[PDB]
Amino acid sequence: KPHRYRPGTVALREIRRYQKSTELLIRKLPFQRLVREIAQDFKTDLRFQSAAIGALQEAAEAFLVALFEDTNLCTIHAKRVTIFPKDIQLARRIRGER
Amino acid sequence: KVLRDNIQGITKPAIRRLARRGGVKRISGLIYEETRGVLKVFLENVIRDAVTYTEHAKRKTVTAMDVVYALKRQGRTLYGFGG
Amino acid sequence: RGSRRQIQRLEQLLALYVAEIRRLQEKELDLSELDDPDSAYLQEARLKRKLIRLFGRLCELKDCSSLTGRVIEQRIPYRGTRYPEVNRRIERLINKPGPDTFPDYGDVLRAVEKAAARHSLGLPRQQLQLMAQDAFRDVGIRLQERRHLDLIYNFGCHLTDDYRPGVDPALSDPVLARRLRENRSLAMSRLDEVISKYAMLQDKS
């Protein structure tokens, strides 16, 4: 059982959230620019807490990955196949949401 | 016949890696555009609810808390957060 | 054992990083700021990276692993087949460290085939395929569960740490509740529509 480091000045629950931020796959500049793109259609005077952008990004990447997990789980072939839009849709109907 | 779509924004390799993170190793051409489109629609959906909360609070800033209450309304993604 | 003084100095820096991260988390970005490559959000991201590197260096200095107690660090056991040799290879497959661990059917089938071949189990093709399919299903559920918990136990920041669902403003304002209900119907149709749009496009090709 590996030795665990527990900083005296920062709780691990904080460290874990910062760690997950570094694991995100979409570049953060294009991500915030996509939020801007959406926000412009609502209201030109909208502001966003930085923390809100981060929450949006963490959840959005999870949402996308789960769509692929579901498609993966519904795809059973001896030889590997390329995933198409129809595959996502069916898997969503079998395993996915609403 | 074949054609390369232009964009500014979310790159093919990011989308390939998101798919891979879900176990999907091979995606078709349309998956790239579809992934960007789905991502945008999901964000619109969350932001629509978040701004509904923001306006209810009579604020002009969307807070992380507005985004949480919104996310909880979008189904399984954040299900169970906060207890 | 690492230098006590240097550990103390580095841990102070670590907390200094945390305070600045929190400050940036509270910054309010207008539309022009969301277009800025040096926005508070990007500064915040850079600092989280810097902090995680420092955390790692502190782990080394204290002769510890780099674990942080993430849910995805927890091993998922697999004992689903009647062949322990197969079970082991599957368990190894699904417990490779990091956020990208999620096999496809082919990965599971290969693991079954490889274990069978290595230990000369003499299992026929169709039996291997059934074994792999049952396994893939079982571990798929557990992998999604572990990631989901990893997300909800490690989400947000100090600004959201006092959230609880019973404080939702919609619970005591039916006008708000009604608009959110209307939003929900739209949101579901919008998602269906984009998923269907790309299916339709595939059909025209």
Closest CA to B27 of C135, C194, A64, A34: A64
Q: Count the Cβ atoms, other than its own, within 10 Å of residue B57.
A: 14
In whole angstroms, what is the distance from residue A61 CA to residue A70 CA?
14
Residues in chain A with CB shorter than 8 Å from the CB of C189 are none
Question: B-chain residues within 8 Å CB-CB of C176?
Answer: 52-53, 56
For residue C159, what are its two tokens? 């600004």
CB count in 10 Å sphere of residue C6: 11
Nearest chain B residue (CA) to C25: B64
CA distances from C85 to B11, B79, C116 (A): 41, 36, 8
Q: Residue type for C109, please?
A: L
Quick one: DSSP state of residue B27? B
d(C-alpha B73, C-alpha C9), whole Å? 44
Distance separating alpha carbons of residues C139 and C133, to the nearest angstrom: 10
Method used to determine the 3D structure: X-ray
Query: To probe the interface with B, which of A21, A48, A53, A61 has the most B CB atoms within 10 Å?
Result: A48
Which domains does chain A possess? 1-98 (1.10.20.10)
Q: How far apart are CA C18 and CA A30, in angstroms?
A: 25
State the sign of the Cα–Cα–Cα–Cα dihedral B40, B42, B44, B50. Answer: negative
DSSP secondary structure string for all residues of C13-82: HHHHHHHHHHHHHT-EE-TTGGG-TTSHHHHHHHHHHHHHHHHHHHHHHTT--S----GGGSPPP---SS
Alpha-carbon separation of residue C101 from B12, B21, B51, C94 (angstroms) = 20, 7, 35, 7
Domains of chain B from N-terminus onward:
1-83 (1.10.20.10)
Cβ atoms of A34 and B10 closer than 8 Å: yes
Phi-psi region of C203 (alpha: psi -120 to 50; beta: other; left: phi over 0): alpha
Residue of chain A whose Cα is closest to the Cα of C135 = A73
Closest approach of chain C CAs to the CA of B27, in angstroms?
A: 13
Residue B2 forms contact with C (CB below 8 Å): no
Structural domains of chain C, with CATH: 1-205 (1.20.58.2170)
Alpha carbon distance A19, C21 (integer Å): 13
Closest residue to C169, CB basis, from B24, B56, B63: B56
What residue has token string 């979310």? B10
Residue with tokens 């420092």: C54
Residues in chain A closer than 8 A to C18 (CB atoms): 9-10, 14
